[PDB]
Structures are given as structure tokens and as C-alpha cells.
Amino acid sequence: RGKLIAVIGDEDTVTGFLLGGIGELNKNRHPNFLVVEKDTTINEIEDTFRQFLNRDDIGIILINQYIAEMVRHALDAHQRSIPAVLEIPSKEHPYDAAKDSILRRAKGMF
Amino acid sequence: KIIETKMLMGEVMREAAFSLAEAKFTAGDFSTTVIQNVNKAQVKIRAKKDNVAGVTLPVFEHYHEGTDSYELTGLARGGEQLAKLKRNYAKAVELLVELASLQT
Amino acid sequence: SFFPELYFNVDNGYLEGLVRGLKAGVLSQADYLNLVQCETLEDLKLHLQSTDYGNFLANEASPLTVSVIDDKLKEKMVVEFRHMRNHAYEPLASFLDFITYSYMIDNVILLITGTLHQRSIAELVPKCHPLGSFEQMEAVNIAQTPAELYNAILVDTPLAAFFQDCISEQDLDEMNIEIIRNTLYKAYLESFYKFCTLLGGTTADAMCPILEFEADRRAFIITINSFGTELSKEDRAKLFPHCGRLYPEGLAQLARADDYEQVKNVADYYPEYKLLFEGAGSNPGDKTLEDRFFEHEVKLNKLAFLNQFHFGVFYAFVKLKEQECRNIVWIAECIAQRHRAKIDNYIPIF
Numbered sequence: 001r002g003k004l005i006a007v008i009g010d011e012d013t014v015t016g017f018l019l020g021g022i023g024e025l026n027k028n029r030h031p032n033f034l035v036v037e038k039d040t041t042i043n044e045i046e047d048t049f050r051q052f053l054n055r056d057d058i059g060i061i062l063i064n065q066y067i068a069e070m071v072r073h074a075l076d077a078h079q080r081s082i083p084a085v086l087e088i089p090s091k092e093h094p095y096d097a098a099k100d101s102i103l104r105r106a107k108g109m110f
Numbered sequence: 111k112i113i114e115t116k117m118l119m120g121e122v123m124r125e126a127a128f129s130l131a132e133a134k135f136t137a138g139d140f141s142t143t144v145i146q147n148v149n150k151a152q153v154k155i156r157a158k159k160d161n162v163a164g165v166t167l168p169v170f171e172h173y174h175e176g177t178d179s180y181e182l183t184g185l186a187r188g189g190e191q192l193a194k195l196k197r198n199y200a201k202a203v204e205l206l207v208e209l210a211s212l213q214t
Numbered sequence: 215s216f217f218p219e220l221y222f223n224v225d226n227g228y229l230e231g232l233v234r235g236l237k238a239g240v241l242s243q244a245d246y247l248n249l250v251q252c253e254t255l256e257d258l259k260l261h262l263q264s265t266d267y268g269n270f271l272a273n274e275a276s277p278l279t280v281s282v283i284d285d286k287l288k289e290k291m292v293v294e295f296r297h298m299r300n301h302a303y304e305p306l307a308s309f310l311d312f313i314t315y316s317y318m319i320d321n322v323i324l325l326i327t328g329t330l331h332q333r334s335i336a337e338l339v340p341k342c343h344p345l346g347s348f349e350q351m352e353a354v355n356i357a358q359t360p361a362e363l364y365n366a367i368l369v370d371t372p373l374a375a376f377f378q379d380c381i382s383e384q385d386l387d388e389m390n391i392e393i394i395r396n397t398l399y400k401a402y403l404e405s406f407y408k409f410c411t412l413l414g415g416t417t418a419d420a421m422c423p424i425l426e427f428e429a430d431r432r433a434f435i436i437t438i439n440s441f442g443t444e445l446s447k448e449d450r451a452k453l454f455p456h457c458g459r460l461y462p463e464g465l466a467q468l469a470r471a472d473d474y475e476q477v478k479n480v481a482d483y484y485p486e487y488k489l490l491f492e493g494a495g496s497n498p499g500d501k502t503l504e505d506r507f508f509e510h511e512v513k514l515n516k517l518a519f520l521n522q523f524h525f526g527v528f529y530a531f532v533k534l535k536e537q538e539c540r541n542i543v544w545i546a547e548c549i550a551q552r553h554r555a556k557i558d559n560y561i562p563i564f
Contacts, residue, residue: 001173002156005203011281015141016130019192020199021152021179029332035145060155060170060210081168084210088119091127092279092550095120102112102213109113124551131547135540135559136504142341147327147391181443184323184395187432189439190502 003059006032006052008045012091013064032058036067046071053083061085065096075101112212115205122205126198133195136188143182150177153203169211172204217415218523225303230522233531236294237519239266240538243562249545250557255279258546267542280546287539292344295532309413309525311372312406313532314345318373319402321346323395325353325363326386332358360386376401393445396436396453403429407457413525421526422457424514429458430487431507437468437477438503459484501559508561512537516564537561 005022007014014035017023023033032055034040034048049071052058059082068075068087075085089096103109133140152175160169179196183189223230241249245265252258255278262268270286271278299310321342328338335354348354352366364383368374379397380389389397403425410421433454440450451469454460460468460480467480481487490510494503511533518530541560548557 001154001175003154003170004151005153005155005206011141011145012127012130015144016126016195016199017203018144018148019179019196020203021196022203023148024151025149031148059157060207062206081214084170084213086119086206086209086213088123088206091130095124096116100116128551128553128556131544131551132559135544135547138540139343142324143327143391146324146331146333178444181439182392183436183439184392185320186504187435187439188504189435190504193439193442 004032004057005060005062006058007062008034008048008052008067009036009062009064009088010090011035011037013088017062026057036064042070046074049074053078056082058082059084063087064090064093065099066090066093068101069099072099112209115209115212119205119209122202126195126202129191129195129198133188133191136191137182137185138188140182140185140188140192143184144180147180151175152177152179153200155207167214169214170207171211172207215415218417222523226306226525229298229302229306230527233298233528234519237527237531237534240534240563241265241267241541243564246541246545246560246562249542253549253554255283255546255549258549259283262542280543280550283546284539284543287542288344291532291535291539294535295345298528306525306528308409309417310528312402312409313529314347315373315376315402315406316399317343317345318348318371319376319395319398321348322367322371322373323391323398326360326394327391329356329358329360329363330387334358373398376405393449393453400453400455403455403457407455415524416521417524417526420518420521420524421529424511424518424526424529426458427511427514429455430460430484431511433458433460433465433468434477434481434487435504435507437471438474441472441474505559505561508537512561512563534563538563 004024005017007017007023014023014033018033023031025031032052034045036045045067049061049063052061061083063085065087068085085101087096087100097103154173154175155170156173158169158171160167181189182192248264249258249261252261259268259271259278267287267290270290271283274282274286295310295313299307299314302310324342325335325338329335335356335358339348339354342348348371350366350370352370353363356362356366360383364386367377376398379401380386380394386394407422407425407429410425411418436450436453447469451465454465454468464480464483468477471477471480478488478491481491490506491503494501494506496502515530515533518524518526521527541563544560545557548554
């Protein structure tokens with residue numbers, strides 16, 4: 001009931017989670033997810049990311065790492081706790097490690 | 111602990127991503143149906159408070175709402191691979207839920 | 215009979231030579247091994263260029279991804295099919311239309327659901343499988359009205375006859391989308407099978423075994439996968455094609471079955487199938503039932519190329535090349551994700 005998880009990622013990443021049972025339509029027929037294709041621009045990704053931050057329905061947002069780099073300014077600009085954002089490795093992009101927002105918040109971690 | 115979890119997340123998501131490849135191999139193009147045919151969630155997250163010390167911290171808790179996921183045997187009837195795929199990502203979500211709580 | 219081997223080559227002589235010439239270009243076991251020894255997607259491209267494949271990823275993005283090579287492989291065989299479909303005459307063209315029908319069915323399932331959840335046709339068409347095409351209007355610009363799509367289909371779309379099972383629109387809204395598509399496909403198999411038997415020569419004898427397999431193979435898998443879901447046993451039985459070896463007696467047992475063990479007991483009566491269930495060890499790190507079925511289906515489609523005067527060579531061609539695409543994508547995907555121990559899960563096509 002309480003909170004949904006929003007997913008912004010590529011076709012395979014979003015498909016996997018949807019089968020994972022997470023993700024649904026809102027009462028206004030809006031979807032708490034975005035599939036990011038090669039033809040999707042920066043403004044559309046950022047507008048979606050922000051709108052989730054301004055929605056109380058979501059909370060945890062799941063994004064691909066390569067996306068985190070595409071709209072990185074929007075990830076550091078908002079510092080709160082609702083929008084817990086987790087950065088995950090895409091099917092082909094390799095294991096994430098660097099440029100993690102949280103790893104940066106703490107500068108005492110290997 | 112958050113670092114070890116981040117490390118584990120890598121391995122778990124890798125396995126889930128591979129499982130998707132197998133489901134696609136058998137089924138063909140199931141991603142189109144899954145993405146378009148979305149209505150209600152089976153997984154939802156309930157907020158809970160953890161009194162770690164004088165400071166009170168917000169923690170997420172996994173809630174298995176119970177609404178059934180879509181059953182798809184339409185393409186090559188690749189049901190078993192999709193069923194294993196559901197399980198692998200289901201587990202992935204549970205790890206990620208824990209992960210979000212740890213960022214707190 | 216004396217039915218073929220006489221008039222057949224008058225119109226279909228060229229296509230028979232061409233399609234078998236195209237078959238010659240399918241990756242051999244020797245070629246698959248050369249493709250495995252890559253570990254790099256760019257090297258995969260380079261090794262593919264040694265065959266009839268290649269030079270089709272040129273002028274694309276410098277980094278090669280799996281999604282790109284997948285789409286391109288489909289496109290190559292679509293062009294080859296459309297070429298053979300266009301250079302053809304009614305006696306053969308009708309056969310090919312049935313093949314395209316299987317893809318049209320999937321595409322109209324995509325058009326509905328989206329129509330039921332207000333999505334525009336123009337947004338849906340780009341993600342329809344090729345060969346669906348739908349050059350006809352009225353299916354386009356339906357104004358997101360289910361009635362307009364159901365009227366355009368009934369009238370203009372060749373699949374109209376098949377929808378006789380699922381009609382009045384009420385069916386579209388009340389039936390689960392998957393029951394609708396499985397029902398429609400069953401109707402397709404029934405008509406297509408009968409069509410093959412009307413062509414009561416070599417085609418019927420070479421082609422029907424393949425369709426009979428598909429009917430029984432789907433009946434088996436449907437029964438198993440349906441165990442964990444909510445579906446009336448009678449409604450499940452309604453989805454079983456009657457063009458197969460289980461139809462006389464056997465489907466009745468699958469319709470009642472509530473467990474894998476009972477399904478195997480049904481297979482036990484058919485050694486051709488029993489071997490598949492016994493071979494499908496289904497261990498946590500082994501091949502499963504779907505994998506053995508694919509191997510069997512390829513055997514059947516390859517045996518189709520042992521008759522030189524029929525239409526079954528064209529059907530088998532499409533399915534074998536479609537599996538060829540699955541095999542190539544599998545290799546590309548295994549490379550990208552570095553799971554080298556799982557590379558030998560492709561279906562050999564000889």
C-alpha cells in the first residue's frame with residue numbers, strides 16, 4: 001500500500017522488474033516507470049525523474065548506472081530520504097562502483 | 111555493510127540479467143507484452159521507523175501485497191524460463207529493498 | 215502420389231531452387247564453433263562475415279550491442295521471405311500467407327490491449343513483428359476505439375475468419391488476453407492443417423507431421439504451465455488443437471491432469487514424446503523440456519528438406535532460420551554477459 005518503486009531503465013531492465021511483480025499504473029493512468037530507448041532525450045529522462053521525486057506515491061527509485069551519468073546533476077541536487085535511488089548495472093554496461101552518490105556522501109569508504 | 115551489499119547486488123543482478131537472456135531465447139519477444147500489459151503491482155513497500163538511537167531513521171520494509179502477476183504462455187509457451195525469471199528478479203527486488211534501507 | 219513432380223515446377227520451380235540455395239547459407243556446426251571462439255562482439259561480427267551473414271552491421275554505431283545485431287538478423291530473413299513471397303503465385307502464396315498469419319495473430323494481440331488501454335496505433339505499429347505489415351487502413355486511425363479495431367479486423371484483416379471463436383467484442387474485454395491469443399492460434403492451426411491436407415500430395419505428407427508435432431507440443435507445455443495459475447480445466451481443454459496425435463485419446467488426460475507426473479504418463483503412450491521427457495532431465499543445471507522440444511522440431515524441419523517437390527520446404531526454412539537467429543543472438547548475449555560455460559546451449563541446425 002504505502003510506497004511504490006519507480007524504475008527508469010532500458011528495455012530489459014524494466015521488463016525484468018515488471019515480471020518481478022513491481023510496478024503499476026496510478027489512478028490517473030500514469031505509469032511509475034520509464035523505458036529509456038536510444039531515441040529518448042535528456043529532458044524526457046530528467047522530467048520523469050523529477051516528477052517521481054515530486055510524487056508521494058513512489059520513494060525508492062531504481063535506475064541504470066549509465067542513466068545516472070546522463071542526468072547526474074539531478075541525483076546530487078536533491079538531497080532528502082524519500083527518493084532513495086539505487087544505481088544498478090545494465091545488461092551490458094559493467095558492474096557499477098565509482099560515481100555512486102552514496103559512496104561520495106561518505107568520503108571514508110574504500 | 112552497505113559496501114558488501116552493493117557487491118552482492120552486482121552478482122545477483124548479473125544472474126537475473128542472464129536468466130532474462132534464457133527467457134528471451136525461448137519466448138522470443140516477451141518484453142513487449144510485459145511492458146505494455148501493466149496494471150497492478152504484486153510488490154509494494156511499507157514505511158517503518160527504526161529507533162537506532164536517539165536519532166530515529168526511516169527504513170523500508172518489503173510488503174508482498176499479494177495481487178497475482180501476469181501469466182504469459184503466448185510466445186513459444188516459454189513459461190518455465192519466465193517463471194525462473196520472475197523468481198530471480200523477485201529476489202533481486204528484495205535485496206534492493208534492503209539496499210535502500212541501508213542508504214538510510 | 216503422381217500429384218507433384220509434374221506440374222509443380224511450372225510455377226514453383228524457381229522458388230524451390232532459390233529457397234534451398236538460401237538454406238545452404240545457414241550456419242553449420244563448424245561455423246558455430248568458429249563463432250564461439252570470439253569472446254568479443256566485434257570479433258563475432260568479423261567471424262560472421264565469413265559466411266552469407268555479414269556486412270549488414272556496417273554503417274551502424276561503432277560500439278556493437280546485442281539489441282542491434284538481433285534486430286538486424288530478423289530484418290535479413292524478413293527481406294528474404296518477402297522476396298520469395300512476392301515472387302509467387304496463388305497455389306504457393308496461400309501457403310506462405312498462413313506462415314505470415316502466425317505473426318499477424320501476435321501483432322493484433324498487440325493492437326488490442328493497447329487499444330483497450332488507450333494507446334494510439336501509430337505508437338504500436340513500430341513494435342509489431344515484420345510480416346504483419348497491415349497495409350490496409352481502418353486498422354489504422356481507429357481512434358483508440360475497440361469497436362473500430364474489431365470492425366476493421368472483421369472486414370479487412372485476413373484473420374477475420376479465425377476470430378469467429380472470439381467475437382462480439384464482449385470476448386475481447388472479458389477474456390484474458392492470453393486466452394484470446396491461444397484460442398485464435400488454435401483456430402489458425404486447425405485451418406492451416408486442413409489446408410495442408412487439401413494439398414493432398416507430398417506437401418501433406420511432408421508438412422503435416424510438423425503441424426501435428428506443434429499441436430501436441432503445445433498441448434503438453436500448456437498443460438504443465440497452466441498448473442500454477444487460475445484456469446478452468448474445461449477452458450484449458452478448449453485451447454488444445456485437434457490436429458495431432460493426442461486428439462483421439464490423450465488430451466482428455468492432460469485436461470484432467472494436475473501434475474507433471476500425470477503429463478509424463480500421457481507422454482508414456484507416445485515413444486516419440488516419451489524420449490523428450492526422459493531426455494529433459496530438468497536438473498538444476500541441465501536442459502529442460504522446452505529445450506528438447508526445440509531440438510525435435512528442428513529435426514522435423516530439417517527432414518522437410520528431403521522432399522524436392524512440396525511447399526513444406528518454405529515453412530521449414532522460416533522456422534530453421536528463425537532458430538538460427540535465436541542461436542546467433544544467444545551467442546552474442548553470452549559474449550556480452552561473459553557466461554562462457556553456458557555458450558553451448560544453442561540448437562544445432564546441422
